[PDB]
Design a protein around this ligand. Structure first.
Ligand SMILES: Nc1ccc(NCCNCCO)c2c1C(=O)c1c(O)ccc(O)c1C2=O
Length: 273
């Protein structure tokens, strides 16, 4: 029933996470994304309520796909003999944040503020649902160009959120916190906050701040672009070397740089139309 119910289109991307294609649901023409993951490259499995053996990515997406949020929702999935196939929402028109920043350079603060806010809301939603993403970064964020709405996408390195230490990590190194680099240990929330400080820097400078391990551990941030004294302050706070000196989500969202955010729609009117 998979190749009857969806019409496949062009490849949208491929890499660590598999191959993803543009698609349409025949039933009604909903734009969808069709993501293929090979069984052999799943290191990490879980089980659903009714109790079958699936990729953790499917468990996590089901836990966050309830109601509306800034997470791309899992509409359906399928098992094949050597792969799983996931059917996801697909906004239209869309551009991932990596390509957006690649095309336009450093974002104006007003736009970064709007985008960063929506990321924080999506991450809180995930954490609320008991899910840790663990690979928050520009290429895992989609922008709906018409509504100005951001959507988080690739849960393949994620895990159930817990309050004890994690000793495995599979996201992107250059977004990984110094405690991971040095001790191979981190807690979920505070590692997520570090990745958010890398993301924010990336947004307002048009590039990531750290490339090598020794830079991460040293944790000294330099601005190549004219940035406010406040935005800088928030970024250096998220990027505190000690996990316990990092802000909580609440404290990020109450920081002075985060006041007077634009709503998504006005964001797209001003910056994306
Ligand atoms: N890797 C990608 C690379 C590009 C991409 N959109 C391409 C649209 N043209 C702008 C270039 O970023 C997507 C993806 C996805 O992984 C992607 C996804 O994983 C789920 C739903 C989606 O809409 C998408 C998705 O729209």
């Amino acid at each position: 029933p998979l190749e009857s119910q969806y019409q496949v289109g062009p490849l949208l991307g491929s890499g660590g996470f598999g191959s993803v294609y543009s698609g349409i649901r025949v039933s009604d023409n909903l734009p969808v994304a069709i993501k293929h993951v090979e069984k052999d490259r799943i290191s990490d499995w879980g089980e659903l309520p009714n109790g079958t053996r699936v990729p953790m990515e499917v468990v996590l997406l089901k836990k966050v796909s309830s109601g509306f949020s800034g997470v791309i929702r899992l509409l359906d999935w399928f098992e094949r003999p050597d792969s799983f196939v996931l059917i996801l929402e697909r906004p239209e028109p869309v551009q991932d944040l990596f390509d957006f920043i690649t095309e336009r350079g450093a974002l104006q603060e007003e736009l970064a503020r709007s985008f960063f806010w929506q990321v924080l809301e999506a991450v809180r939603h995930c954490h609320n649902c008991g899910v840790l993403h663990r690979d928050i970064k520009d290429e895992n964020i989609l922008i709906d160009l018409n509504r100005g709405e951001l959507k988080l996408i690739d849960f393949g390195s994620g895990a159930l959120l817990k309050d004890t230490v994690y000793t495995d990590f599979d996201g992107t190194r250059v977004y990984s916190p110094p405690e991971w680099i040095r001790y191979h240990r981190y807690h979920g929330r505070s590692a997520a906050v570090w990745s958010l400080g890398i993301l924010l820097y990336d947004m307002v400078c048009g590039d990531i701040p750290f490339e090598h391990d020794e830079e991460i551990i040293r944790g000294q941030v330099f601005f190549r672009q004219r940035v406010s004294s406040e935005c800088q302050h928030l970024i250096r706070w998220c990027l505190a070397l000690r996990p316990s000196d990092r802000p909580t989500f609440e404290e990020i969202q109450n920081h002075p740089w985060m006041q007077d955010v634009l709503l998504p729609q006005e964001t797209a009117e001003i910056h994306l139309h």
